[PDB]
Structures are given as C-alpha cells and as structure tokens.
Symmetry: D2
Subunit: 325 residues, 4 copies
C-alpha cells in the first residue's frame, strides 16, 4: 500500500515548452498540464499513488493573492481527507519566495505540502523538472516529512518556506538560504533530514484564510540612493493597508524614505522595514519609523503583513508575528 | 620613501560613535572626523604618508548623486597630481553597492581608489573599522593594486566595485559576490590578488562627469506578486529619465509591470530589467519590454543607467554598456 | 539574579598575544589566562555571574582525546550542579571541528555548552575575541538556548557542533555550514534562533564516557590520485580500532584505497568512508568496502567512530549511529 | 566555418550507465565510449566540428599521474596543430580538483582546454551530462575563451582550474570556489565572462612535462587531533619526493606533525603545509617547518609540488611557485 499524493499544478517553467532544446531563456512559452508532467516521470508510480489537479496555468510572475487564496483553501480541503497523505505543488520559480511562505502560514495540517519548480523547460537539455518532481513526490510520500512546515524541493534540496529564496536569476542551484541552509537533502534516492524550522508554522499558526475572499493590499518600495518620496504617495493614494520597505542595509531609511513612511503611518498604513541585502536581521530601532522584518525578505514580509492585517492593525501584535513567524 | 595616500571621508558607521560598546544597532550616531579615524590607527604611518579630507559627513543611506559628483571630481583632481599615489574613501555600508561602482565608471586613473566601511561603530566591542581602514590603506599604497578598477575593502577582502554588495543586513562578512568572488584577500599583513575584473572600468571607461552638474533621475521599481502599475505612473509623472526594474527571477514582468514599462518606454524613458534575486544573469528576451541588466544588481544598474543617460538615450547603445561595464 | 556561567579555558588564539597589533599570523605566541579574557570584556557582568577556570593552555592543533575526556567529565559535573546554568569553553579554531562535536555526544545536560574562539589574537587590531566571548556568554546565559545541543559562537553566529566547521584557513567568518546554515544569530545585542538540530544529541545520546579512561585510536587517511596503500598498513600495524577515509568525491575509493580498507576490515578495524569535499552526503554503496559517514566530515566522523567503538564493534550499529547522530 | 574541437575521453560518471534511472549513486557502473557521448547531444554540430578520442576508460578516483602525463602530452600535440582550435576533456568529478590544475601548469597553448564532468549518470533522471558537455564544447569553440587557463564546466559555470573544487560529495552544483567565484557563466545559450585568473598559467607556465617519463611521488597526510607521526615515517620509508600536509586551520602542525615534517625535511623531502578547511590562505610562519600552500588545496598543492620537483628541490624557489601559480 503506497501513499496517496495529490499534485496541484499552477504553471511555471516546470510545465513550459520551447521550440528548441537549447532554448532555456527568451522563448515563446507553451504550457503543459499536470498529467503531462506525471506521464513524463513514470518512476513516480514506485513512490506513491498519484492524482493530478490543475489549479492554475500561469507563470509565477503573474501569481496573485487571489489564486493563493484558492490554492490554500484547496490544500486544506485535500489534507483534511483521510485518502490524501501529502500535496505536491508545481509552481514557477519567479515568485516561489512568496507562495510557499503563504501556505506555511495558512495550511492547517501537519501533512507535507511540497512546492516544486524547474529552472529549465521540459524540452530543454538536462531539464531539471523531472528529477525535482520525483524528489518532491518522494518527500510528500515520506511520513518523516510531517510537521516541518511547507517544503520547497529543487536541485536535490529540501528548503523551508520561511527561509528559501531564488538567490540567482538563472541557475539550477538558485534556491538557497545562506544563513539557514536546508531542512534536508535528497541523495541516492534517500531523504536526509538535518534541520528543523524554529518558527511558528502550519498547525500552530493563527492565520486562517478559509473565510477570506480578498486580502489587504500591500506594496513593496525599494530603498536606494535618491529614492523618491512620491512612491509612498502613490501607495497612500491607492489606499494600501501595508507597505514593506526593501531597505538599504539593515532597513535604513533616507530622509525621503523616512518622510514617506511617516506619512503612510499617519494615514493608518502599517509599514515594515525589510532589507534589500538578501539575508540577515533588521534590528529594532526607535530612531526610525515602521516595524522591523526580523530576517524576513521583502517578498516574504509582504506575505506575512497581508495575513497579519486580516487579524489586527495593532503594530505591536504585528511586530510579534515578525519575530515568531 | 612611503607612498602618498589621501583619505576622503563621507561618513558612515566607520565614523560612528555610541555611548555603549554593546550597541551596534539602533543608537545615537556620533559623527567622527577624518583626522580622528587616522589617529585611531597609528599603524597607517608604516604604510604611507596620510592626508585627510572631509568630503561629506552623512550616513550612506542619505548618499546622493550630487555628493557622488563632488566625490568623483575630487578623486580625479587628486589622482591627476604626482603627489598622490592612491585614495581611500571611508563610506557607509548601506549604499556601498552604488558609490564604488559610480567611481568605477567615472575615475580617469589607474591609481587605486579603495572604498572602506565598517559594520560596527568605532566604540563597539571588536569594532571592524580599524582593521578595515588598515587593510584599505595597505591596498591603496600597493602599486600592484593599480589598473584593477575601484576596490572595496572590508573583513580582509578586496572586492570589485562591479560585483561586491552588502548581502547581509547586519553581519561583518556581509560584502560578498557568490558568483564572482573577491579580486584579492588581505591575510597576515600581506595582499594576495587572485582575480581580475574582466569588464571595462576606470581609464578605459567612456563615462565622464567632470562637466556634469546634475545627473538624470532614475527610479527602481520592485517586482513581486500583485505589483502595482501605478508605481510606473508615478515615475512617468515626475519625468525620470530611467527606470530600473528589480524583477522577479530573471527580470520577469507581470502583466501590470509589462504595461508600466511599455508606458514608460513610449515616453522616452529607458527601462532596464534587473533582478531581485541577488545574483545572476538577466538574459535578453524579445518577448519582454525593456533592456536587460546582465549580471548587474538593481542598485548598480541604476548607477550605470544614470551615467549612460548623460551620453545617450539609445536602447541598443545602453544595452551594449550593460554587457561591457 | 543573573544566571551563573562557568568559563572553561583550553587555550587558542583567543587567549593569544603577538609582538605587534598588525600581527595576526606568524608570530611568537604568548598565553593569556581565563581571568585576563574576562576582565578584557567588563560587559560580561551585565549578562551573567562569571566564574573562570583554566582547564588547559594549548593550541587546538595539539588538543588530544585524553584532554577531551577530562573536559567532558568536567562539563558533566559542572552542569549537574543546581548553581550552574551554562558553560562557555574558550578553544582554538584549528580543531574546533572535533571538540564541540565530542561534547555534543557526551554531555548529558540540556544546559548550554557554548564553544568560543577567535581568529585574531587579543592584541591584534579589531580582535574578534572580545565580541565572540560576549556573544558566547550571552548565548549560555539565555534560557532559550537550552536543549539545542553543543553550540559554537564566532562572528555573531551560533552554529551546531554537528554541522559547523572551519571552512577557511584565515578569515573571521570561517565557521560556516553551507548545507545546514546556523542555528541562530546574534544581532543588536539580541539572540535570534532560526533552526534546530534534527539529530540525536546531548541528553538523548547513548555515548557515555564517564567510566572511560582511554579512547580507541582512530586515524584519518586522505583520498587522492596515486594514494598509497601503505598508509593503511601503518594504521593496521599500530592496532587502531577505527579508520576514517577522507574520500575523493562521495567517499570513492581507488584500487589502492579499496585494498587498504579491505585489509583493515579483515583485521577487525571498522572503516568509515567520509569525504574530502567539505560537505554533502556519502551514500551507501554495496560495491565499496567500509561504512558511510552520511554528512559527517572526516574530523567529526573520527569523533563519532571513536565514541562508537567504546560501546560496540558491530558495523550495523555503528552505521545506525552515523545516520542518527 | 565552425571551429575544430577534439573531445578526449578519460571516463567518469558522465560516461556512466546504470540499470535504473533512479540510480544516481551506489550502482554497477557501465562504460560509454566518446562517440556515445557525442551522438547523445546532436546539438554539438551547431557549435563545432567534433572529433573524439578515448584516452582512458576509468573512474577519476583511479586517475593516476602516468595517465595525466599521457593526457598532457596528447593535449599539447593536438593544440600545436593548426586544425585544432580547442580541446574538451570528459573526466570524472572525484579528482577533478587535480586533473585540470595539472594541465593548467603543463599546457603550452592559449587554446581552450575545457574539462567537463557529470554528477549524475547518462541514464539518470535529469542527467547533467548532456548540458555540461554542450556548455564545455561551446566554451572551447568560443574565441573569447582563449588565454584564460584551463577551464572546468559544470552546472552552467566556467571555473578556473586554479580555484574550482568539488565542495559537496553528491550535488549537481558541487563545483564552487567560495573566495574566487567563477571566471564566467553560461546563461541562455550565451557565455558571460566576468573574472580572469591572476596567476601564472598555461603558456607562461615553466612546468614542461614533454620530457618527463615518470612524475615524483607525493603523499598527502591529513591534520587532526591525535594525528600519528608514523604516517610521515611511512612516506619516508617509501622514498617520496614531496609531502603535502592537509593542516588543521591555517596549516597548523601538532607536536607529532611537527616532528614528522622535520624528519621528512632531514631526508630531503620537500613538505608543503596546506589546509583541510576548504579555502583560504596558509600564511608564512618561521615558527613552523615546511613551505606554505598559499590558497592551494591539499589536492592542488600536491599537483604543483609534484611538477615543481621535476625542476628543482630548492625550498625558496618552490615557495615562490606556490605564490605565483
Ligand atoms: N517565468 C517562470 C520562471 C520559472 O518557473 O523558472 C515562472 O516563474 O513561472
Ligand atoms: N547606516 C550606516 C550603516 C553602516 O555604515 O554600517 C551607513 O551606511 O552610513
Ligand atoms: N593555532 C590556533 C588557531 C586559532 O585559535 O585561531 C589554535 O587552534 O589554537
Ligand atoms: N566515481 C566518479 C564520480 C563522478 O564522475 O561523478 C568518477 O569520478 O569517475
């Protein structure tokens, strides 16, 4: 009796197709279904009983919070069933920073939720998709993968949704977390778990979007030399509920950024100072406005802020989420 | 006789002072003069004859293109003299991604221009400033450091202005370049050069800002899920000459980002697609609008685009600069 | 009432002194007592009630298994007392791969055992010792640091004794674990735990050396092109109980290395195939002799094998230790 | 017309064939000829005119100095011809630390010598071989690859033979150089060179093996706690010409290692102190015996020492080679 795994497809280059096998970038992309991905890897039949389901068919650069609501609700419906042991989600790499972390806070089950992607299309020479999908299903079918939070599997690595991000624009090994490493690795058709996420996730999370139809809008504004104050004005004008600041260094604000953040806060907008660096802690500073993002990236900080605004508008409670989640 | 090195001060945590040494973050920053930094390390006298100038006294988060013009003009004025062998620039870490790369394209000399910074204030326990400054002066005083482009010295490393960036928000070893490494290292009071910059820099650069009073305005717009098109509308309204897109993955645009970029291009604004990932190549794509940033980060792409706009607005010529510089 | 922390000194460059402050390497090293290190950082009094003890005064390159036995028995006696909350151990960096992992398997307490070291002597410019010691004591005094296994603190990082190793010969940031990251970080006088060790350690470990006078001899033989078979003959002649093979790639043996290992196994010597690469999994292979080291480095594999030989010689039980510890 | 590239096969997992595609490790390895590798990638015909030769059919773990001597002589006579523009060498990954660096010092031409390997067998799911081979041939056929030293191409990276090493036992992205990065990358069917090797290589190298029948024997002895002195006695007994010490930290010797090295030096054996860390500089120290390996790893130090012993035994001259090569 093999485990029962459901593969939910949302699109991405993993389900992409090009005219030539030498083409990995800059091509008229064609989408493939979940059944085509399953049929491409007949070795999945030794791991688990597989059922395919197409949630979406878009590039992750076009992934929206509305589709994330639909995805999370469907994952929760499936994991509540006794005939589903785990869920594998085929997704694009461009916003694989956000999607798994969204599910890390919204999934109400200990059963494995494994995001999977590919940097090369299925038609490409040495396409990474087939092995990544094999690894993802293997992880989801393993009972030892439970209670570890949402997992992300690419290039023989098992990364945490809380730390893993696309660190390189175009390489196969792009998904890394320099300061936190990987939760596990897949070597020689065997899973080796090494670390556990020391943050609040899945079953112990207070965030629930089961009865949420629309999430609060949150913008991300970059921090740099000569950064305009008018970007904050644009966010205020359109009435966003939150703003994540991709700050210079440890979330440092310029005179124009400081003025823009305080103007947003006076209108009731919750601002969180993250970092454009790529990793590390943004420490508390009473001399600067806004909350701090802890070690959360601008992309993941936005996700947490959106979900935090569904529960509260209290800055201290939201700050507590950033240090715990 | 010893070489003649001039230390130009712009500010930063390297010249920062706190009431307690346990404080490294969120403190009352006390700005120190260039002479105080020189007197703190009397071992600089064994390396070279030191002179100090105070170009600026601000945090790098407030570093502007106007101050960079003043800095670049002063560096070129000093390096043209026979009594100056090299220059050391004490700067902050928050925008040390931009400043050195600016001078990497504007300095008209093979003489060493070495940027130096510190993550911990001078008062802090195990302050990195003193050793960083010693290493920077040592690098600038070495004649073998010539013709290598603008250098950045922190944590015993010599990084290229073209590749090095603050990769972590709060650590001493934050300045890294995972795909390109370091040009050299400083170990045991000795310099070990290992790699050379294979890009156009300094003397061979066509970018000259000697007769430039004001640089063209360039904004950076971040790429993420549900990214607003109105950010581009804000840039267009304020009449920016360039827009750098910190794209999802390999500079991928959403439907709103695509619309915002094409709207900017119709107004004559040159848009360059960079990446929010942290490293890697953004490959050319005819299916997407805007130019491609090659391996240049959003911060450095903005610097190059700003300087490219002083000479031309032609997309093909600017694209050529992005692959060469 | 502040926690009671005991600082045990074994030596190292953290307690080293040079002729000049520009000397970090190649000098006549002097020794500093445990009290000299404590008085150098008066900020330790705000963290905990400190009591220093001098266990040894040697370079870690000369650290032996006999001294580790004495250290482990002493730590166990200290932590068994109700008036001790944690222990900080000043040690050298050269064999900081072995020592903490030894205590990770032998210390029977949830109370923090924090190893600390320095890459620069206390006399050097921007000596890392003072801050590393401050960070180590802060970790040991924190109640949240309990039950996390043996910790290693340098350069604002909290690494696991199971994963952390000296990855660079001479840099301050040398202690890394690319595949596993850090358990926590120390930023802005605050501790941020991110991951937990998912292996058997400390309290749950079966390795008890309280009644052990002398440990079994284990050698490490390197794997390379034209590697001699006579090195294995030298180990067999001296009657070692174990041999760790620092293998090429994934612990691959040459024809001479295969012959040497099989000859050792016939004499009752338990051989474990590790890797010279620096990281990763050495997978099981029925076509090759010896056991596999999992992700354990040659240095750490020797430590585990040495402790495993005090309990059993059964290859199946020892292999189970390598996948669980 | 297209360039003329010769592919020299030595063996390895790139030419490996397993029973099942889920088998990447621990399998009965099969041997695939050079023509089988060429016919597997028909896209090589668009890059260059290909001719294949079978130099060897062994795993790199069994690669010997006599085969490297034969390989180097064959590469040199091929590059001397006008009908050969570059050479691609299919090799194993286990000793890809040594082989390319050997040729980096022995090749007497600016024509590209590109080593290529694969972590997964040709039969495996998402086998890296085909893309790596395509990338290697593309690099060898590119005129811009000339005068850059021996290149190593895997996972879309172009690494220098001087710096690149297998850093992980079992992953696709194993070939890294933390402190030096890559010379270039292959993204979207385009080569992007970023750094150049700032060491003496190929054409300018003084190490000629045209008239060498047998290379001097050089052993590598590992440095660790309780390291035996008898390993050095075994090397002296068999009359090796050199000994590379894989030292603890920055090549630090124990009391037994110090006694063993000085005993080797008294018998005329040249000893070089390298590091077991994985990267970094081993600094000169008059207080310790033996020469220093600079930034060279134990594997690469052995290669340089072996080639230096064909010319001289003078300690100061060999030490100079270690800082220049
Ligand atoms: N544009 C693609 C990139 C990828 O999947 O690799 C996506 O994110 O859907
Ligand atoms: N806020 C400081 C940060 C630093 O220098 O470390 C600056 O950039 O000026
Ligand atoms: N030789 C020293 C190196 C250090 O501590 O940095 C030791 O390990 O004791
Ligand atoms: N055992 C193989 C490993 C590989 O090529 O991946 C070899 O080096 O030949």
């Amino acid at each position: 009796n093999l485990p029962n795994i459901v593969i939910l497809a949302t699109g991405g280059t993993i389900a992409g197709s090009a005219a030539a096998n030498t083409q990995t970038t800059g091509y008229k992309a064609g989408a493939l279904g979940v059944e085509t991905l399953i049929q491409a890897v007949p070795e999945l039949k030794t791991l688990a009983n597989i059922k395919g389901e197409q949630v979406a068919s878009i590039g992750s650069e076009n992934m929206t919070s509305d589709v994330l609501l639909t995805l999370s609700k469907r994952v929760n419906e499936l994991l509540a069933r006794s005939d589903v042991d785990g869920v594998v989600i085929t997704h694009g790499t461009d916003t694989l920073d956000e999607s798994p972390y969204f599910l890390n806070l919204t999934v109400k089950s200990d059963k494995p939720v494994v995001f999977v992607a590919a940097m090369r299309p299925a038609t490409a020479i040495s396409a990474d998709g087939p092995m990544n999908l094999y690894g993802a299903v293997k992880v989801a079918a393993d009972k030892n993968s439970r209670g570890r939070g949402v997992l992300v599997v690419l290039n023989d690595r098992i990364g945490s949704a809380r730390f893993i991000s696309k660190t390189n624009a175009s390489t196969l090994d792009t998904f890394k977390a320099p300061e936190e490493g990987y939760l596990g690795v897949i070597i020689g058709d065997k899973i080796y778990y090494q670390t556990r996420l020391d943050k609040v996730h899945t079953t112990r999370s207070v965030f629930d979007v089961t009865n949420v139809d629309k999430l609060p809008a949150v913008d991300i504004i970059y921090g740099y030399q000569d950064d305009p104050e008018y970007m904050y004005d644009a966010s205020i004008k359109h009435g966003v509920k939150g703003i994540v600041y991709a700050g210079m260094g440890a979330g440092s604000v310029s005179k124009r950024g400081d003025a823009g953040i305080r103007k947003a806060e006076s209108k009731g907008i919750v601002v969180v100072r993250s970092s454009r660096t790529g990793s590390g802690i943004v420490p508390p500073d009473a001399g600067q406005p806004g909350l701090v993002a802890d070690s959360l990236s601008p992309a993941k900080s936005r996700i947490l802020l959106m979900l935090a605004l569904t529960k509260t508008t209290n800055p201290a409670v939201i700050q507590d989420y950033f240090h715990a989640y």
